[PDB]
Amino acid sequence: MAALIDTGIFFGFYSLKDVHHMDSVAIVVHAVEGKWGRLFVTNHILDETLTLLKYKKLPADKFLEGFVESGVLNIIYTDDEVERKALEVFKARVYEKGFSYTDAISEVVAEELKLKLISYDSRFSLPTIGRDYWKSLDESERKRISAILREKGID
Amino acid sequence: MAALIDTGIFFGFYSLKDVHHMDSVAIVVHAVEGKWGRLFVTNHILDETLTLLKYKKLPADKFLEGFVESGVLNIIYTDDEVERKALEVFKARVYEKGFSYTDAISEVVAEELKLKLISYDSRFSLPTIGRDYWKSLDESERKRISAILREKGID
């Protein structure tokens, strides 16, 4: 039906030496091919991703053109009621390492809109898609995706 | 009338060894005393601040209680029209080091709502308040603020 895609997916896609790089290539190919239906980010994920890609000297410009300007991703602009709940979640987890306000927003939004959460972050309270994605595919599917990667020059 | 307070202000306040620490103490005291009127953050600044304080092992909890739950800060939840403009600003500055999507939002919001921008970030297109704030005060005002700092135990 619909998915919410976490920052780390996009980071893995552009960061060539990242441990999740092939995970991200495969997830991105499947996502744009429609595997999980309509694709969302929150405006918090959007901010985090743009800022991080730019900070890490990665193709923020290509992310913009390819994912955002293309309308490949739909953006959810979170209102005061979503953020009030996210703040409660954030406060509850304030002492837990590595749980951001972005993540708090992601949990509220994915739960309220019944979105599949695509993320490498193993700390979410909702099940996620992403970990060991590349290694879980058919060998034939790997070959197909690898061909797309090097031939069509995605990245 | 009203001010928009940037993340770096809050970071300087809690980071005791930060170069801007006394800058932030002084700005925070003046702000809560009403010098610039009503105080705002965007939900992007809110996210950035909460996440960063927590990441740096600083009192995210005390920030929440003291600034957010207290209603000392008002939060602006940015809509699709503000974000559409921020995206244009971000794209224009994509190759410029250190300009975030949060900053893009801050520029749009402060310009549209005629907010004073309180920030150490010397890269904004709007004038800002913050740089050399501590060194610019009367010696008597420094002493008053220092007394508040060590006596009332703010931080």
From Swiss-Prot, chains A, B:
CDD domains attached to this UniProt entry = PIN_VapC-Af1683-like (cd18679)
- Residues in a coiled coil are none
Q: What is its EC number?
A: 3.1.-.-
Q: Which UniProt keywords apply?
A: Hydrolase, Magnesium, Metal-binding, Nuclease, Toxin-antitoxin system
**For the PINc domain, which residue ranges apply?**
4-125
- What does the UniProt record say this protein does? Toxic component of a type II toxin-antitoxin (TA) system. An RNase.
Q: What is this protein called?
A: VapC ribonuclease AF_1683
